[PDB]
């Protein structure tokens, strides 16, 4: 292995007091697992590649794959208006938003989170029915859980299924992810890590509206690397392969970052400075005018695809370059700085590419 994983990861774990981390890398078709520290600080139970971590917003890549799958299966087309697939949105602003804009955070300024008062399905429908766009559709990117959350919800229901059903019964089994969960079952609680807050309490995920779609997957590094493997020359089912290809399609760009379904990608080679900038709050916190594509673009293999994710007590990152057959998954039970995740992953990936 050309990479020096221990030498890059261990100083970072110390610098941010990360209790445990599961790292998995792919190179030349083989998976390598590097496990550090503890899943549970009071028992001392060790992290393995089967430890379940909250992967937070990395869930959006699975949600995007599910939505692309529903589109390939005929439930909807990406250029359909959103209200074509939700009778309760007819006449609302979503008459003028496409499913693709919803999935790529460009509907027009949907916020990062639902307002605190939205705590039921009924209040969720009312929220979207009364939503006032900040920007014209397709012109501005504001990263948003309500946006891709609604995409995942409506995509699944376009096949007559709840999101959780289509994810748990179709997408995850077809991807080969048998230890990946929206809700961790009884048989697997022994493997579920605790997270540790920035204030340092043991904490686990708070359920919320459309949490499953936007940030609610629990999985280990082995299962998550298997999903990344499917994103690098998947040999198999035509519908699922077409779905994955749609997630590698670009719909707009902000600076050097191109927004796909779930995945965000960069030209490869990519500098650390560019990858840091694309994952900084200058991109993730504020609404930015996008570079527009007249038609969506199949982006290609010689690119760095990535996604960050966090919960109250967890911090995750995934990046891969399909043309190189290299990948890194980093799942931690501390929500530690995105810049540290990016710097470490860029260093390791640069070495794997040698
Ligand atoms: C994803 O984990 N989340 C969405 C947003 N952070 O975006 S990032 O993950 O791309 O950095 C807010 C925090 C978090 C969440 N659980 O809502």
Please tell me the CATH code under which domain 1-354 is placed.
3.40.710.10
Query: Has 252 been labeled as part of a binding site?
Result: no
Task: Tell me the CA–centroid distance for residue 313 and ligand 1, in Å.
Answer: 12
Structure tokens, 212: 């499953």
Q: Parallel, antiparallel, or unpaired for β 257-259 and 264-267?
A: antiparallel
Whose structure tokens read 């030209």?
267
50 contacts: CB under 8 Å, gap ≥ 6: 179, 191, 220, 222
CA 106/CA 250 separation, integer angstroms: 13
Dihedral Cα 111, 116, 120, 124, nearest 10 deg = -30
Least Cα distance to 124 among 134, 133, 111, 115 occurs for 115
Whose structure tokens read 């920007």?
135
Using only C-alpha atoms, what is the Rg of the chain? Answer: 19
CB 309 within 8 A of CB 143: no
Question: What is the crossing angle of helices 121-129 and 145-157, to 10°?
Answer: 110
Least Cα distance to 205 among 101, 335, 112, 72 occurs for 335
Structure tokens, 194: 């605790």
Q: How far is CA 23 from CA 198, 306, 352, in A?
A: 21, 15, 14
Any atom of ligand 1 within 6 Å of the Cβ of 249: no
Could you write out the three-class secondary structure of the chain? CCCCHHHHHHHHHHHCCCCEEEEEEEECCEEEEEEEEECCCCCCCECCCCCEEECHHHHHHHHHHHHHHHHHCCCCCCCCEHHHHCHHHCCCHHHHCEHHHHHCCCCCCCCCCCCCCCCCHHHHHHHHHCCCCCCCCCCEECCCHHHHHHHHHHHHHCCCCCHHHHHHHHHHHHHCCCCCECCCCHHHHHHECCEECCCCCEECCCCCCCHHHHHCCEECHHHHHHHHHHCCCCCCCHHHHHHHHHHCEEEEEECCEEECCCCEEEECCCCHHHHHHHCCHHHHCCCEECEEEEEEEECCCCEEEEEEEEECCEEEEEEEEHHHCEEEEEEECECCCHHHHHHHHHHHHHHHCC
Q: How far is CA 233 from CA 163, 230, 244, 348, in A?
A: 26, 7, 10, 21
CB 305 within 8 A of CB 292: no
158 contacts: CB under 8 Å, gap ≥ 6: 70, 75, 76, 85
Task: Tell me the CA–centroid distance for residue 153 and ligand 1, in Å.
Answer: 18
Residue positions counted in the chain: 354
Query: Has 85 been labeled as part of a binding site?
Result: no
Task: Tell me the CA–centroid distance for residue 10 and ligand 1, in Å.
Answer: 25
Any atom of ligand 1 within 6 Å of the Cβ of 57: yes
Cα angle 275, 277, 280; round to 5: 110
CA neighbours within 13 Å on the CB side: how many for 280?
Answer: 11
Which approach determined this entry? X-ray
CA 214/CA 120 separation, integer angstroms: 16
Q: Tell me which residues are annotated as active site.
A: 57
Task: Tell me the CA–centroid distance for residue 297 and ligand 1, in Å.
Answer: 26
Which atom of ligand 1 lies closest to the CA of 60? Answer: 1
Any atom of ligand 1 within 6 Å of the Cβ of 144: no
Query: Has 213 been labeled as part of a binding site?
Result: yes
Domain residue limits, the chain: 1-354
Which atom of ligand 1 lies closest to the CA of 338? Answer: 11
CA 295/CA 90 separation, integer angstroms: 26
CA 354/CA 351 separation, integer angstroms: 5
Neighbours of 7 (CB within 10 A): 11
Which atom of ligand 1 lies closest to the CA of 113? Answer: 17
CA 307/CA 214 separation, integer angstroms: 12
Q: Parallel, antiparallel, or unpaired for β 218-219 and 202-203?
A: unpaired
Query: Has 153 been labeled as part of a binding site?
Result: yes
CA 44/CA 39 separation, integer angstroms: 7
Least Cα distance to 78 among 320, 293, 230 occurs for 293
Least Cα distance to 150 among 202, 207, 100, 103 occurs for 103
Neighbours of 176 (CB within 10 A): 13
Structure tokens, 310: 């966090």
């Amino acid at each position: 292995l050309t990479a020096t994983v221990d030498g890059i990861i261990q100083p970072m774990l110390k610098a941010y007091r990360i209790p445990g981390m599961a790292v998995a890398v792919l190179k030349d078709g083989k998976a390598h697992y590097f496990n550090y520290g503890v899943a549970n600080r009071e028992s001392g139970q060790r992290v393995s590649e089967q430890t379940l971590f909250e992967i937070g917003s990395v869930s959006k890549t699975l949600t995007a794959t599910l939505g692309a799958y529903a589109a390939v299966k005929g439930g909807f087309e990406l250029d359909d208006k959103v209200s074509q697939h939700a009778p309760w949105l007819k006449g609302s602003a979503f008459d003028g938003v496409t499913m693709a804009e919803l999935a790529t955070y460009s509907a027009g300024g949907l916020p990062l989170q639902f307002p605190d008062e939205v705590d039921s399905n009924d209040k969720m429908q009312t929220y979207y029915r009364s939503w006032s766009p900040v920007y014209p559709a397709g012109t501005h990117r504001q990263y948003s859980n309500p946006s891709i959350g609604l995409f995942g919800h409506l995509a699944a229901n376009s096949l007559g299924q709840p999101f959780e059903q289509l994810m748990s019964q179709t997408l995850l089994p077809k991807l080969g992810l048998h230890h990946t969960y929206i809700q961790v079952p009884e048989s697997a609680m022994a493997n579920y890590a605790y997270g540790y807050s920035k204030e340092d309490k043991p904490i686990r995920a708070t359920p919320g509206v459309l949490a499953a779609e936007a940030y609610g997957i629990k999985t280990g590094s082995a299962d998550l690397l298997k999903f990344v493997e499917a994103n690098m020359g998947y040999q198999g089912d035509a519908a699922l392969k077409s779905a994955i290809a749609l997630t590698h399609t670009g719909f707009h760009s902000v600076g050097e970052m191109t927004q796909g379904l779930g995945w965000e990608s960069y030209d490869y080679p990519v500098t650390e400075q560019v990858l840091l900038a694309g994952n900084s709050p200058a991109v993730s916190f504020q609404a930015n005018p996008v570079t527009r594509f007249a038609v969506p673009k199949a982006m290609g293999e010689q690119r760095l695809y990535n996604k960050t994710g966090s919960t109250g007590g967890f911090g995750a990152y995934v990046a891969f370059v399909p043309a190189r057959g290299i990948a890194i998954v980093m799942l931690a039970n501390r929500n530690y700085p995105i810049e540290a995740r990016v710097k470490a992953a860029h260093a390791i990936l640069s070495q794997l590419a040698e």
